[PDB]
Amino acid sequence: SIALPAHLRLQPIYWSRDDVAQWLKWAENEFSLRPIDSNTFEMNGKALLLLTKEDFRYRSPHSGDELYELLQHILAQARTVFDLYFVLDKSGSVANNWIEIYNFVQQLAERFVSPEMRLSFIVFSSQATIILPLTGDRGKISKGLEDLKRVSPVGETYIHEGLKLANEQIQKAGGLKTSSIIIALTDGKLDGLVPSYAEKEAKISRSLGASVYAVGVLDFEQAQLERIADSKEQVFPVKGGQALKGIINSILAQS
Ligand SMILES: [Cl-]
Ligand SMILES: [Cl-]
Ligand SMILES: [Cl-]
Ligand SMILES: [K+]
């Protein structure tokens, strides 16, 4: 096992350009390597993972081979397996904004591609349905995104039913013995006692150890979403575009 600094324990695909430079500095001291110019790998972690070992050797004649192998060992290190459950409003009210919801999910799916990530897509209006059962298969995730794009919104906003399906999957996955995240996308416009249903189901989610995020669409009800999510800090606007980097970092910081 490699004992990395705490702030470098994230999977390297998430490393910034500054993280790469910090990794080099750490490796130099840890392995008594010859000094590494700080811009020897001027790129982020996604880019670093595309280089070949030959590329490492050319960039660092004195240490490139060791650095490449160190990266391979780091990639092999055990990390927190995250299950991400997207619970998506497809009620009639979002008929003209289904595109925002789909593309938001697509952008997060394209980010969370490290092998330890598994994704599930749930939609809800009057009833909830699993479009994509929890999986890490990037192929199945591609098809689930194809299916999501085709959804025709209609019906009520029974978000408690969508959360219920996420919780049922979580329970089957191990409950407290998992690292589960729920990402609910909705305007938060809940009728009748649905606010009570939804808040009860979300506390079940947390009872199972999951962390709940709410992503607001349209003129969304900020207060209602704060009561469903773990905290105000886990409510994000889909219109934030920065909002994507915010929720990604928040999720990665749960590990
Ligand atoms: Cl960067
Ligand atoms: Cl060198
Ligand atoms: Cl699978
Ligand atoms: K994908």
Author numbering: 12 to 252, 254 to 267
Per the authors:
The ‘TELSAM’ variant of the human translocation ETS leukaemia (TEL) protein sterile alpha motif (SAM) domain is a 75-amino-acid (9 kDa) polymer-forming crystallization chaperone that is soluble at pH > 8.
No twinning, pseudo-translation or TELSAM-polymer flipping was detected in diffraction data sets from these SUMO tag-free constructs. The vWa domain makes glancing contacts with a second vWa domain, burying 240 Å2 of solvent-accessible surface area. Pro144 in the vWa domain also interacts weakly with Asn107 in the adjacent vWa domain. It was discovered that increasing the linker bulk and retaining the 10×His purification tag improved the diffraction resolution, likely by decreasing the number of possible vWa-domain orientations in the crystal. In the constructs reported here, retaining the 10×His tag during crystallization clearly did not block crystal formation and may have improved the crystal order by limiting the possible binding modes of the target protein to its host TELSAM polymer. While the inclusion of a noncleavable 10×His tag appears to have blocked the vWa-domain binding mode associated with TELSAM-polymer flipping in the current case, we expect that polymer flipping may be dependent on the specific size, shape and preferred binding mode of the target protein.
